[PDB]
């Protein structure tokens, strides 16, 4: 079937949408084999060990982001979080309807996503806007009731150590380094699927449900999962922001609770089956949605090239063709997975420390957009948290934003940021404790950065018109001095985040209060498009 069908009614604002529509619109041809069936049975056997809880209306309401799109039925995210009678009554009727109606397609809104990318006129032109498909607020709360515990627990139970979202950036690095070191002669590659969401078939969605159905579930949760699969997950009609009929979808919706979980399970299933078809030796996989990384035993240069073509042919049959053809790599640092690469630095005692980094162009351009205009989500804050050990996040992002927060006297004001797909409300004064917990004390003492990493950062600053690193060192010293003068958590920000800036670097002992932070919900699962929210506690 066609991934999408269109009426011709425009994807309306809340211009490049038409270019995206052409790429994502195609008929899918899927052919399954015994490798696929074997991997599926193995995945199902692991899913069989899961017991999932039905969330109450209240618990599901508490997970709703405060700025989540309002319902077309006379209530918004604030009403949901406050447990308002109107919101609650509507949620209970949406739920009752899921239990009673097993067939009627549920309506979804289609929107062009507004994302900031860097204006590079050297290697090509402007990329089209991504498309977001999501159901009404009442349906989104019901999804949580039936599937929040499933999407949070099942991927790890099924995929084990291959499930990427259970790891913090440091644990992701440790996984990859250990996998690389475990091989006699390692070879690794990233597999990029062309428009993954559009490659997801109705059968892929039902196979995914077959995995969810292996959980121990309450009868209502079981019915709701069955109804949500047929009425929403498999496809349904598309409505633009103006309320007009845009067409229809027969592929993955990017804005449903099961997007991340479903994409991870589907990518894993297809990739593990393709590994067997290609006869890749001693495979270690790391999957994050449609992002796949494979580390295996090299069979020789020519053999490795042949095995990747074979892997690609199998992924193509399974309806996961490549965007860019995969390339074998013989250094771990050369693999870009989740837009990131492994790099190494030294701690205060000269000991080797592996960390995750990336090209800083997009993070800096988005930070520049956020500094210029008020935004709902602060990507700069997410990049500080995720890339805390990096030269660019420490010297540029921390320095720039802490000088702004000092000037605005907003150090204690909680800000919303995304941690892989979920929304977290974080006070910037909590950054030293968060960083210590996710990356370790060494994140504040790292030095001896690689020449390639230093050069990538420096060239990027030049290209974007950002002052050089020496200017940032000078700015951090003033920022640090002012933070120190304030005491408490503000002084900790100065002492810990800006220890790299000082002439004579300070000792740095663990932050006593860091252990108190409740990071239990943090690196459990991916919730991209899942409409998930949390406020940082203790
Ligand atoms: O020879 C030497 O010794 C070096 C000298 C030198 C060179 C340039 C400056 N620049 C400045 O002082 C000003 N800008 C900045 O001090 C500045 C700060 C952050 C900047 C950013 C980002 C960095 C990441 C957080 C968001 C802000 C960008 N740009 C920035 C400029 C340059 C800019 O204007 N815009 C963009 C656009 C895209 C990406 C980055 C930028 C402020 C007043 C006049 C312009 C200062 C000193």
DSSP string for 14-27: ---HHHHHHHH--B
Phi, psi of 163 (to 5 degrees): -75, 105
Q: How far is the CA of 397 from the centre of ligand 1 (A)?
A: 12
The answer to whether the CB of 490 falls within 8 A of the CB of 411 is: yes
Structural biology method used: X-ray
Length of the chain counted residue by residue:
538
Which residues pair with residue 297 across a beta bridge?
Answer: 186, 281
Q: Which of 412, 406, 342, 419 is nearest to 379 (CA)?
A: 419
Cα 55 to Cα 145: distance, rounded to the nearest angstrom: 4
Q: How far is the CA of 350 from the centre of ligand 1 (A)?
A: 32
Nearest protein Cα to ligand 1, atom 20: 466
Nearest protein Cα to ligand 1, atom 10: 467
Cα 259 to Cα 255: distance, rounded to the nearest angstrom: 7
The answer to whether the CB of 537 falls within 8 A of the CB of 425 is: no
**Ligand 1 pocket, CB under 6 A:** 364-365, 367-368, 371, 396, 400, 464-468, 470-471
The answer to whether the CB of 268 falls within 8 A of the CB of 285 is: yes
Alpha helices in 290-387 (DSSP H): 301-317, 361-372, 379-386
| Resolution in units of Å | 2.6
Q: Which of 368, 394, 469 to mutate to test the pocket of ligand 1 (most atoms within 8 A of CB)?
A: 368
> What is the number of H-type helices and E-type strands within the chain?
20, 13
Q: How far is CA 443 from CA 42, 125, 169, 364, in A?
A: 39, 37, 12, 20
Cα 379 to Cα 339: distance, rounded to the nearest angstrom: 15
Q: Which of 163, 159, 184 is nearest to 175 (CA)?
A: 163
Instruction: Give the number of C-alpha atoms closer than 13 A to the C-alpha of residue 218, restricted to the C-beta side.
Output: 13
Q: Which of 397, 399, 465 to mutate to test the pocket of ligand 1 (most atoms within 8 A of CB)?
A: 465
In 3-state terms the chain splits into helix, strand, coil percentages (rounded to 5) of: 50, 15, 35
> Exposure pattern of 234-258 as b/e (b: 16+ CB <10 Å)?
bbbbbbbeeeeebbbbbbbbbbbbb
Q: How far is the CA of 457 from the centre of ligand 1 (A)?
A: 14
* Cβ within 8 Å of residue 448, ≥6 positions away: 345, 346, 350
Place of tokens 């709703």: 64
> Exposure pattern of 433-466 as b/e (b: 16+ CB <10 Å)?
bbbbbbbbbbbbbbeebeeebeebbeebbeeeeb
Alpha helices in 245-324 (DSSP H): 259-278, 301-317
Pairing of strands 422-426, 533-535: parallel
Q: Which of 160, 143, 162, 142 is nearest to 151 (CA)?
A: 143
The answer to whether the CB of 423 falls within 8 A of the CB of 65 is: yes
> Exposure pattern of 360-381 as b/e (b: 16+ CB <10 Å)?
bbbbbbbbbbbeeeebebbbbb
Q: How far is CA 360 from CA 227, 274, 397, 464, 466, in A?
A: 43, 33, 10, 10, 12
Q: Which of 386, 409, 258, 187 is nearest to 398 (CA)?
A: 386
Token pair recorded at residue 63: 């997970």
Cα 440 to Cα 205: distance, rounded to the nearest angstrom: 39
Q: Which atom of ligand 1 is the closest one to the Cα of 468?
A: 4
Q: Which of 467, 468, 471, 479 to mutate to test the pocket of ligand 1 (most atoms within 8 A of CB)?
A: 467
Cα 288 to Cα 163: distance, rounded to the nearest angstrom: 7
């Amino acid at each position: 079937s066609m991934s999408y069908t269109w009426t011709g009614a425009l994807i309306t604002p809340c211009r490049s949408a038409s270019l995206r529509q052409k790429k994502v619109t195609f008929d899918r041809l899927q052919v399954l084999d015994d490798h696929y069936r074997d991997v599926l049975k193995e995945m199902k056997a692991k899913a069989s060990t899961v017991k999932a809880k039905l969330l109450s209306v209240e618990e599901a309401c508490k997970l709703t982001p405060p700025h989540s799109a309002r319902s077309k039925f006379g209530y918004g995210a604030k009403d949901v979080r406050n447990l308002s009678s109107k919101a609650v009554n509507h949620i209970r009727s949406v739920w009752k309807d899921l239990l009673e109606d097993t067939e009627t397609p549920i309506d979804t809104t289609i929107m062009a996503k507004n994302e900031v990318f860097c204006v590079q006129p050297e290697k090509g032109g402007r990329k089209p806007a991504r498309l977001i498909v999501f159901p009404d607020l009442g349906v989104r709360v019901c999804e949580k009731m039936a599937l929040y515990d499933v999407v949070s627990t099942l991927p790890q139970a099924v995929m084990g150590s291959s499930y990427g979202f259970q790891y913090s950036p440091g644990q992701r690095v440790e996984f990859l380094v250990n996998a690389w070191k475990a091989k006699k002669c390692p070879m690794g590659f990233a597999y990029d699927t062309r428009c993954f969401d559009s490659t997801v078939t109705e059968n892929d969605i039902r196979v995914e449900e077959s995995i969810y159905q292996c959980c121990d579930l309450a009868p209502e949760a079981r019915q709701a999962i069955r109804s949500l699969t047929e009425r929403l997950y498999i496809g349904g009609p598309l409505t633009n922001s103006k309320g007009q009929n845009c067409g229809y979808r027969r592929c993955r919706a990017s804005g449903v609770l099961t997007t991340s979980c479903g994409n991870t399970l589907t990518c894993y299933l297809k990739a593990a089956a393709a590994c067997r078809a290609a006869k890749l030796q001693d495979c270690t996989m790391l999957v994050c949605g449609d992002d796949l990384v494979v580390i295996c035993e090299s069979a020789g240069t020519q053999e490795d090239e042949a095995s990747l073509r074979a892997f690609t042919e199998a992924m193509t049959r399974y309806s996961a063709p490549p965007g860019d053809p995969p390339k074998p790599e013989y250094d771990l640092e050369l693999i870009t997975s989740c837009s990131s690469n492994v790099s190494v630095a030294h701690d205060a005692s000269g000991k080797r420390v592996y960390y995750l980094t990336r090209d800083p162009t997009t993070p800096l351009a988005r930070a520049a957009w956020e500094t210029a205009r008020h935004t709902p989500v602060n990507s700069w804050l997410g990049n500080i948290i995720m890339y805390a050990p990096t030269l660019w996040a420490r010297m540029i992002l921390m320095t720039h934003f802490f000088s702004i927060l000092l000037a605005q006297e907003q150090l204690e004001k909680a800000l919303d940021c995304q941690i892989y797909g979920a929304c977290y409300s974080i006070e910037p004064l909590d950054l030293p404790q968060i960083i210590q917990r996710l990356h370790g004390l060494s994140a504040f003492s790292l030095h001896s950065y690689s020449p390639g990493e230093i050069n990538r950062v420096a060239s990027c600053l030049r290209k974007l018109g950002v002052p050089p690193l020496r200017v940032w060192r000078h700015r951090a010293r003033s920022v640090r001095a002012r933070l120190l003068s304030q005491g408490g958590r503000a002084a900790t920000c100065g002492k810990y985040l800006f220890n790299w800036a000082v002439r004579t670097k300070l000792k740095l002992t663990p932050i006593p209060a860091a252990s108190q932070l409740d990071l239990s919900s943090w690196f459990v699962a991916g919730y991209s498009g899942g409409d998930i929210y949390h406020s940082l506690s203790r």
